[PDB]
Structures are given as structure tokens and as C-alpha cells.
Amino acid sequence: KVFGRCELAAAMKRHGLDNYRGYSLGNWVCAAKFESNFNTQATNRNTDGSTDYGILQINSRWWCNDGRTPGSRNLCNIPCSALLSSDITASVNCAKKIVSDGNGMNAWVAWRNRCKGTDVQAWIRGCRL
Numbered sequence: 001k002v003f004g005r006c007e008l009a010a011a012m013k014r015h016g017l018d019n020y021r022g023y024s025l026g027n028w029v030c031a032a033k034f035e036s037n038f039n040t041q042a043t044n045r046n047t048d049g050s051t052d053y054g055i056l057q058i059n060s061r062w063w064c065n066d067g068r069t070p071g072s073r074n075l076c077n078i079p080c081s082a083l084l085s086s087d088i089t090a091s092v093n094c095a096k097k098i099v100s101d102g103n104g105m106n107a108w109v110a111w112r113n114r115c116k117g118t119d120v121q122a123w124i125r126g127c128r129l
């Protein structure tokens with residue numbers, strides 16, 4: 001799918017990410033443009049061999065079951081193909097769980113560099129919320 005700026009991320013507040021679990025709603029929208037550039041089907045493999053899945057860019061090494069990751073935990077317990085589709089209705093349980101780990105975005109790579117220390121209200125600015 002192809003989402004516009006104000007139309008891909010108005011659903012995070014619908015999923016309870018608004019100020020969810022120590023991270024405020026404003027710190028969220030910026031990174032998604034930095035992981036898959038507002039596109040749900042952009043997936044990539046990694047030189048760790050663990051293939052990533054979705055605009056979330058999650059890999060089967062630690063987080064899910066793609067059948068090609070042995071010694072993989074899949075503590076998330078769902079098909080990695082379970083998030084690339086148009087509907088993402090449940091897709092947020094692991095984004096949420098991936099934070100209770102006590103690390104937060106410590107797993108997210110781009111935000112820590114591209115969105116960390118940035119002007120975030122600018123990313124969520126002008127839209128209605």
C-alpha cells in the first residue's frame with residue numbers, strides 16, 4: 001500500500017500509542033518514514049541473515065517465524081507475513097512488546113540516529129489529532 005503523510009499515521013492514536021508507555025505520541029511518526037518510507041510492503045534482508053518484515057523492518061532472527069531463522073526466538077509467535085498486508089489491525093502488539101524489554105527503541109536503528117535529537121513536532125505538525 002501507499003500512504004500519504006497525514007494518512008498513514010493517524011491510526012497510531014487509534015492503536016493507543018498516543019503517549020504510550022513512556023514514549024509520547026509525538027516521538028512516533030517520525031521514524032516510520034525512516035524504516036520503510038510510509039510503505040507497508042518494503043521488506044529487506046540483513047547481513048545478519050535475519051530477514052526484516054514490513055515498514056516496521058522486523059527480522060525473523062529475534063522477533064518472528066519466517067521458517068528461515070533457526071535459533072530464532074519468535075517470542076512474538078506470529079507469521080512475519082502477518083504485517084505486510086493492507087490490514088495491520090494487530091501489527092502493534094510486537095511494536096509495543098518490543099519496548100517492555102526495558103530497551104525501547106534501543107532495537108530501532110534509524111530513529112536513534114535520524115529521529116533522535118530531532119524536531120519531532122515538525123513531523124506531526126499541521127495534521128489534525
Ligand SMILES: CC(=O)N[C@@H]1[C@@H](O)[C@H](O[C@@H]2O[C@H](CO)[C@@H](O)[C@H](O)[C@H]2NC(C)=O)[C@@H](CO)O[C@H]1O
Pocket residue numbers: 034035036044045046047048050052056057058059062063106107108109110
Ligand atoms: C530502515 C531500515 O530498514 N533499517 C533496518 C533496521 O530495522 C534493522 O535493525 C535491527 O537489526 C538488528 C539485527 O541486525 C535487530 O536488533 C532488529 O531486528 C532490527 N530492528 C529492530 C527489530 O528494531 C537492520 C538489520 O536488519 O537493518 C536496518 O537497515
